[PDB]
Design a protein around this ligand. Structure first.
Ligand SMILES: *[C@@H]1O[C@H](CO)[C@@H](O)[C@H](O)[C@H]1NC(C)=O
Ligand SMILES: *[C@@H]1O[C@H](CO)[C@@H](O)[C@H](O)[C@H]1NC(C)=O
Ligand SMILES: *[C@@H]1O[C@H](CO)[C@@H](O)[C@H](O)[C@H]1NC(C)=O
Lengths: 166, 597
């Protein structure tokens, strides 16, 4: 849980990092904006899934939630039996002029299955004419970069999210 | 793979791309405004050019999606907003000519300065210049000289340019499937595709004329009272059965009658309610004023301002340390970034202006949850109305006493109420006929009802039969009086102010009824009224996704404009004026002139 919560930099939400690893000092940090545990409380194989998302999309990291993040980037089963921890990282993951390192998938043909990771950057074919690998009419690159800035609002500030699955 | 899904995907891409291309431009403009350096100017220009190029490319891309095969109203509205090509419909040469004409007219207006023959070397600009004379001077000859000089230079300079501008704008509007440019302006109120809420462009003229006809008697009584007080001020220049001269209306164009207050004050012994001295005595700062405004908006029910508002806003004046123009402006930079820029000082006027801009920012925060394109007022006359109703709520004596700014033993004498009502009348009622006249003249000039050789004649006939104002000096066809105004020569619509006033009073009456206020409408305070806040927010969160008629019905229960709230706001003043106008002729004769009488 050392580098899990205190890594130098986190990965994108579409390329979310998965690591195989006392849940009391973690809860008593008194610095996490979201510590929502589903099924099992923190007091009562472990997968640690780390990524960075936007502030207002944290509510999409709950079971049974719609949205682009859940549909195309990171989906959780309705029978989730872990915990979701999210905390603001405006000082770390934002810089003057914008921080365009973090990306997310915006377009897909179908929704992600639970605990699925997709990395292929195949050109989205919205229309009927084939894209042929060239961006154009009805042809869009599926990955978009977050525009994290220090002066953004709370709902647009970077948020580091770690999911513990038991 | 249908057209609906293709358009939805295109808008999905465009909403995400538009953000941070508008945010960078907003940041550059904010840096330029707060910190005036050449590098900031270049950065702002580059960001604006990049955003404009992105917008034009997106419009070109969106023009390939037909609206016939679209069934969703929101998608159709967004594609209508984006596909609009405007001046790009004309040829490159026509576009260059139109841009050159517009820039030349703007430069002629800004740099224009009349100079007396006695000393051509030193002479007065427009600001403050002739405006100070028109606001403060009591000299008939000086006012007439300033008026006639400004006309004879500016209108003569802008006449052929305005004619070419009219021709080019008519061509552009016709190329965009419109009857004329006036139809293009009236298109901002068009509602279609919605059952029970449709609004036609031709309905706007009818509605404006009906409301003006309903307003006319109050304006007639106010005009008679102002004429009586002016004859008191000017003994042998103003006839008691005729119109008023155009150079004695308190400002340059007769747009507002506020500066006439000192001449037309009912009870000069009784003073106005000014709390500047109390604010100084209590050691109030700009942060304190904005905190009280935020407290008022929290009390009415709307949420409090974000932390970034209190950390990135220029609520004060930095000084000579860094230059910054501080016209009071509410900024919505995007991505949940809201700011206010103004040199707030210790003054009641700054207090009301702070509440006004705070209401603007609250409205922006309310509709910020909508898709990018649908992030404006339902029509062009809602932001200002919301700000003005906030100002009216903050200006009431009840609010002043409640916040600890007026002594509890203050007696609200009815003379003070009459004085306040007459000041509000001079500010509000005296500009509606001018706005209606100017918009009607421009509309029928664009239509073609007025030939090029009847512009000035018809303009002055409208002045005489509608506004009740007579020109002091005869004019000819080499003059262009409307071009002397900023909006006319800078390509700006003008009916927004009329509609804004009507919406203002409708909203005020609706919220006062919701707030359970008993008594006059001018003594109403929506403070501590959570239901009024609920209704207001329910209207504000729609943005421009829903027709403005739907939002108007949400607030006041009526689908169209109405002047009954405006007439109800001024009822005590109307009765008082009727009492004072018992022995005076109410009306005017459109024959008398200062030169032909
Ligand atoms: C304003 O701009 C100048 C030059 O661009 C810079 O030196 C100065 O620090 C800026 N002011 C602030 C408050 O950043
Ligand atoms: C239009 O699309 C929005 C989502 O983009 C949807 O919520 C709404 O129901 C649609 N309206 C119609 C009439 O299909
Ligand atoms: C609103 O309520 C607060 C708290 O009771 C009170 O201090 C304030 O004076 C009230 N304002 C008005 C206008 O009644």
């Amino acid at each position: 849980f050392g580098e899990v919560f205190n890594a130098t930099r986190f990965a994108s939400v579409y390329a979310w990092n998965r690591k195989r690893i006392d849940y009391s000092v973690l809860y008593n940090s008194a610095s996490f904006s979201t510590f929502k545990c589903y099924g099992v409380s923190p007091t009562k194989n472990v997968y640690a899934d780390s990524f960075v998302i936007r502030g207002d999309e944290v509510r999409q990291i709950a079971p049974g939630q719609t949205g682009k993040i859940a549909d195309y980037n990171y989906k959780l089963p309705d029978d989730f039996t872990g915990c979701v921890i999210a905390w603001n990282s405006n000082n770390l993951d934002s810089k003057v002029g914008g921080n365009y390192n973090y990306l997310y998938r915006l377009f897909r043909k179908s929704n992600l299955k639970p605990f699925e990771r997709d990395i292929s950057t195949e050109i989205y074919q919205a229309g009927n004419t084939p894209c042929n690998g060239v961006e154009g009419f009805n042809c869009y690159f599926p990955l978009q970069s977050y525009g994290f800035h220090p002066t953004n609002g709370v709902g647009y500030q970077p948020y580091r999210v770690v999911v513990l699955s038991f | 793979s249908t057209i609906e899904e293709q358009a939805k995907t295109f808008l999905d891409k465009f909403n995400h791309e538009a953000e941070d291309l508008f945010y960078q431009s907003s940041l550059a403009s904010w840096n330029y405004n707060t910190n005036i350096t050449e590098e900031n100017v270049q950065n702002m220009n580059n960001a604006g050019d990049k955003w404009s190029a992105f917008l034009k490319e997106q419009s070109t891309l969106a023009q390939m999606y037909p609206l016939q095969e679209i069934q969703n109203l929101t998608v159709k509205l967004q594609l209508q907003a984006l596909q609009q090509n405007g001046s790009s419909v004309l040829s490159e040469d026509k576009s260059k000519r139109l841009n050159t004409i517009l820039n030349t007219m703007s430069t002629i207006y800004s740099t224009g300065k009349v100079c007396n023959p006695d000393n051509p070397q030193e002479c007065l600009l427009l600001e403050p210049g002739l405006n100070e004379i028109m606001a403060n001077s009591l000299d008939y000859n000086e006012r007439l000289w300033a008026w006639e000089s400004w006309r004879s230079e500016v209108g003569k300079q802008l006449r052929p340019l305005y004619e070419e501008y009219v021709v080019l704008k008519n061509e552009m509007a016709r190329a965009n499937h419109y009857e004329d440019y006036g139809d293009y302006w009236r298109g901002d109120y068009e509602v279609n595709g919605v059952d029970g809420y449709d609004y036609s462009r031709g309905q706007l003229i009818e509605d404006v004329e009906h409301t003006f006809e309903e307003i006319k008697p109050l304006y007639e009584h106010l005009h008679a009272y102002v004429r009586a007080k002016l004859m008191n001020a000017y003994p042998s220049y103003i006839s008691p059965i005729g119109c008023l001269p155009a150079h004695l209306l308190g400002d340059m164009w007769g747009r507002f009658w506020t500066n006439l207050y000192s001449l037309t004050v009912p009870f000069g012994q009784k003073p106005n309610i000014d709390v500047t001295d109390a604010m100084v005595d209590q050691a109030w700062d700009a942060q304190r004023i904005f905190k009280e405004a935020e407290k008022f908006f929290v009390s009415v029910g709307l949420p409090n301002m974000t932390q970034g508002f209190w950390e990135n806003s220029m609520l004060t004046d930095p000084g000579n340390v860094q230059k910054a123009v501080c016209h009071p402006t509410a900024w919505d930079l995007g991505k949940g970034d809201f700011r206010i820029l103004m040199c707030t000082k210790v003054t009641m006027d700054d207090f009301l202006t702070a509440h006004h801009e705070m209401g603007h920012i609250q409205y922006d925060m309310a509709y910020a949850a909508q898709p990018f394109l649908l992030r404006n007022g339902a029509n062009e006359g809602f932001h200002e109305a919301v700000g003005e109703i906030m100002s009216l709520s903050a200006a009431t004596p009840k609010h002043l006493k409640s916040i600890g700014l007026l002594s509890p033993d203050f007696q609200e004498d009815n003379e003070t109420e009459i004085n306040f009502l007459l000041k509000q009348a001079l500010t509000i009622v005296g500009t509606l006929p001018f706005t209606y006249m100017l918009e009607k003249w421009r509309w029928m000039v664009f239509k073609g009802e007025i030939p090029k050789d009847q512009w000035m004649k018809k303009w002055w006939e409208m002045k005489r039969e509608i506004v009740g104002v007579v020109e002091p000096v005869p004019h000819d066809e080499t003059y262009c009086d409307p071009a002397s105004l900023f909006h006319v020569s800078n390509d700006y619509s003008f009916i927004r102010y009329y509609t804004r006033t009507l919406y203002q009073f409708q909203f005020q009456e609706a919220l006062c009824q919701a707030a359970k206020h008993e008594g006059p409408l001018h003594k109403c305070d929506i403070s501590n009224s959570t239901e009024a806040g609920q209704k207001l927010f329910n209207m504000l969160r729609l943005g421009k996704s829903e027709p403005w008629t739907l939002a108007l019905e949400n607030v006041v229960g009526a689908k169209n404009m109405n002047v009954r709230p405006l007439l109800n706001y001024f009822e005590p003043l109307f009765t008082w004026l009727k009492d004072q106008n018992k022995n005076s002729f109410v009306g005017w004769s459109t024959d008398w002139s200062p030169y032909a009488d």
